[PDB]
Amino acid sequence: DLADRFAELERRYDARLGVYVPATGTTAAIEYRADERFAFCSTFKAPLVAAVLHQNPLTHLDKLITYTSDDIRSISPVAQQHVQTGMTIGQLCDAAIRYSDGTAANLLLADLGGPGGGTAAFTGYLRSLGDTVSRLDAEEPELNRDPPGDERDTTTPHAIALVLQQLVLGNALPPDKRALLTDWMARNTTGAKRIRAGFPADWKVIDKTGTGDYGRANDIAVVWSPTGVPYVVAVMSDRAGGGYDAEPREALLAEAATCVAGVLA
Amino acid sequence: DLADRFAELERRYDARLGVYVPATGTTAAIEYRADERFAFCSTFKAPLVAAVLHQNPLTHLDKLITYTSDDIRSISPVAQQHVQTGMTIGQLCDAAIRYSDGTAANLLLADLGGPGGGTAAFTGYLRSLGDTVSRLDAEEPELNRDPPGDERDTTTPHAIALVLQQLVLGNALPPDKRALLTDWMARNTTGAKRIRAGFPADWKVIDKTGTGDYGRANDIAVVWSPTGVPYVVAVMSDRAGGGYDAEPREALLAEAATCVAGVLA
Amino acid sequence: DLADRFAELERRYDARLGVYVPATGTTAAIEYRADERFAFCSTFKAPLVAAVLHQNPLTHLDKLITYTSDDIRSISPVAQQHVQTGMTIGQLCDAAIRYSDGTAANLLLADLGGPGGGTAAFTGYLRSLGDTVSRLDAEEPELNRDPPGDERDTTTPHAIALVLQQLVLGNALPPDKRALLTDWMARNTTGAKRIRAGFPADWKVIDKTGTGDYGRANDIAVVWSPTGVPYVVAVMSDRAGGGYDAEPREALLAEAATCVAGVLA
Amino acid sequence: DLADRFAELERRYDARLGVYVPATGTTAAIEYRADERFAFCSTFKAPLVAAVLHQNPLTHLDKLITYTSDDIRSISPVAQQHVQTGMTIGQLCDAAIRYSDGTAANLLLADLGGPGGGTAAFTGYLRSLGDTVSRLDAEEPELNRDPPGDERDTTTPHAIALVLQQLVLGNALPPDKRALLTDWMARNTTGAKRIRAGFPADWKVIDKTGTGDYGRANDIAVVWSPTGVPYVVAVMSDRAGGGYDAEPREALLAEAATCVAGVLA
């Protein structure tokens, strides 16, 4: 059936594929390696922003945060420009979602506080919505470099999809803060060739990508059918065995998204 | 296999759906009511141009054709504007494909000459390409309103797909004339909500639409995978039971195109 | 001076140009041969529909009208298809506006009744909105062939623009009937290369074209600025020197429309 | 008389507008603050690509360039995705023009070599084409935030228009290399709401945008009339008085482009 093409796509792209689509009232749940651990990568920035939103008032977005030149460690296209000006929490939220700003993510983790620079506070927030599997242990860019098989900084397509469903479609945030998260994901600039490229243009797509070593390429997304029916699509992939320097294949994520669209149509 | 979704689409739209995709080297052929007769409607204008292209040298496209106001007996968005100046054979080809100009099609049939105002000459050209099923018996706009069950002005998704394959992908025309047909189909303006709306934007789509009474809506097309693999997609549909004035449902054709796209990925 | 470009366009196209744009609160009125008589041609079909709407209830649109093949005298892409079934008043309104159906216009004129097949009743309707200049004396297609200098079947850009302003922007019709006129004019299919081709795509354009002998080409339209400010643009032209068979030049109307857009910007 | 509308637009938008259109054989040059200095912003990426093309054979476009995470110090929608794989010189040209990739621009400046990371080499190339005014002193993103009144990283509408004319319309590049520059500018994705939005759709538009702080918004472009006559349109604007955080107003550039189109018609 459909689980055979996923294995076919795995051969043609030499990767390990993970797909989960939560079941709705009208459709059944799509699963393929759904409960196998994949690396969070940049996709954790999606619940991270929601974590800052959940515990703090809206005025917290206007707090100005200053940082130094030693604080930049990974790709940070926005943090590099404001070393003298500083950035507000809201600007750090925009950078972490739409541009995958690594340094902005580290500062938002620090805003959560606690041990591990906010990693313990973040996974603790992950447990509050019922995710007892995911875990964040390092910061950027260390979380992208974990060896295969290591359980640190990992989630699963099943686990990450249900969190995103509660955050965008559920009641994990008041409408209030919920529309801020959704709007940042709608104007994302880093995922044009992934799940968005696999769905027809008349489908609305909001997403948050993830990319790391060992050919790791992820994309969590919420799509809307042309009639307005929403779905949650979690697509993760790595190429463990091809080495640390294995190139990630975005086409595999886009090809799998077309397979999912064929079923939901 | 895929034929369960197609039947689950016929009930939702109160229509009869026909789908055929010729098999390539790596994939099998998709069929659903593939050998059932559907009305040609305006889709015959695509091989009609190929018949005029095939029978004449390239310089024949510069021949000026004159017509009167009585020749405008159907929707003719381009021929209606040049009644005083006349239009060349090449302009008649452009209008019949990109705008589905009914009057332009009738003049091109006259250019083929012969009995039935060129209908016998057109069906003969279809027989030369191996099409032993299709038949054109009337002109515009009579060909659209044949009663259900009548075999006049009908083809089948199997027959029309194999005809289109020889014209675009095969060698039924020399390269110079073949590129003229493909470009006219690429710049079509009437199929934005059919097969084009069912495939992702990174797939190239050239098509020719057809629409008539009894909720008739067809779309023949050639699609190109993002890597460059070509496919032929014939989608035809009617709702004859709903009556002469039944609206055609373009969403059904776009939804079926998304189901097919999921398989070709 | 904008009136120099209009005379420059007249020299470059070998034509006589007429332009009138009613003055709004913020802009001055554009005039060029504004009070010179030009042939109505198909542009009279816009106030003709308003005449049937104004004098008759909405239920009158469902009345079925029967006609014979001898009643088809002018370009009639829709009346030719429904000669056996007949057409309702509402369909005759649709045909007369979106496709410039000549036969549908004659049948709508007959619906106004009176002497001259409804021409005297129609000009009487023009007098009710304050237009003491325009006059319709013949039917289709005779009104398109009046010799130059003849005052029959003529209007002026000044007169026709102020009439159109009352019908779309004014209170000449109640809201329920006004929306029917605007919707047919918005989905017009015969004016894509005239006023529409001269304004940028972010401007909304509704129009009704006219074309006749002696190189007659007209276009009356209501445009909306990207911010929502409405304007009325009347553009008419003929080439009463190139002879009876002189080709009309659509580019002249489109070029003049870009000149007007430059002033309203 | 066009400079009065430009002055009204400056008051309407709280901005300073600069417009220059080089004179052709039949038309005179349009000027408004044509010799006043405006900030280059991203518009320098167009002649920068031409400088790299000019100094190297076509095979140099295949040279692979590698970079680190610190090379991403600005918005780089393409360079952020290929930091692991590296990008050839040709992709850097595509990214710097079609996506305004800041990091791709910095790498191309480095390919020119010399003092100042290639800025001195770039300004030298402008002097070879006769540009005695422009000057590039910094890299991205420092060049976008020079204080008002500072002459660094500035050009003029007069100077930038003549440079673009030599590169697209002149002989500053051989035909094989000229078509590469022209094709990249035709497929631009960042200028849909500027000069392109001010010209009618039947005009061909290739452009390169620029945006920075102090409300800086630029668009240099080459437009083609529907008959095929080309024009060069340089439109620059800033709102320095409103401060560093002043919003740029794209509508002003699109509105001014509509004023120019009315004159060139």
Residue numbers in the entry:
A (entry chain C), B (entry chain B), C (entry chain A), D (entry chain D): 29 to 293
Kindly provide excerpts from the paper associated with this entry.
Beta(β)-lactamases are bacterial enzymes that provide multi-drug resistance to β-lactam antibiotics. Mtb β-lactamase (BlaC) is a broad-spectrum Ambler class A3 β-lactamase capable of hydrolyzing all classes of β-lactam antibiotics used for the treatment of tuberculosis. Sulbactam (SUB), clavulanate and tazobactam, all β-lactam based suicide inhibitors, irreversibly bind to β-lactamases and block their activity. Here, we report in atomic detail (between 2.2 and 2.7 Å resolution) by room-temperature, time-resolved crystallography with millisecond time-resolution (with timepoints between 3 ms and 700 ms) how the Mycobacterium tuberculosis enzyme BlaC is inhibited by sulbactam (SUB).
Due to its smaller size, SUB should diffuse faster into the crystals than CEF, and the signature of an enzyme inhibitor complex is expected to appear at the earliest time points (3 ms and 6 ms). Nevertheless, contrary to expectations based on the size of the SUB, no electron density is present at the earliest time points. This can be explained by the smaller second-order binding coefficient, kncov (1.5 mM−1 s−1 for SUB compared to 3.2 mM−1 s−1 for CEF), which prevents the accumulation of electron density at earlier times. At 3, 6, and 15 ms, the DED features near the active site of subunit A are weak. At 6 and 15 ms, density features appear closer toward Ser70. These results could indicate an initial trace of SUB molecules migrating to the active site after being held up by the guardian residues. The guardian residues open the active site after approximately 6 ms, which corresponds to the outside ligand concentration of approximately 35 mM.
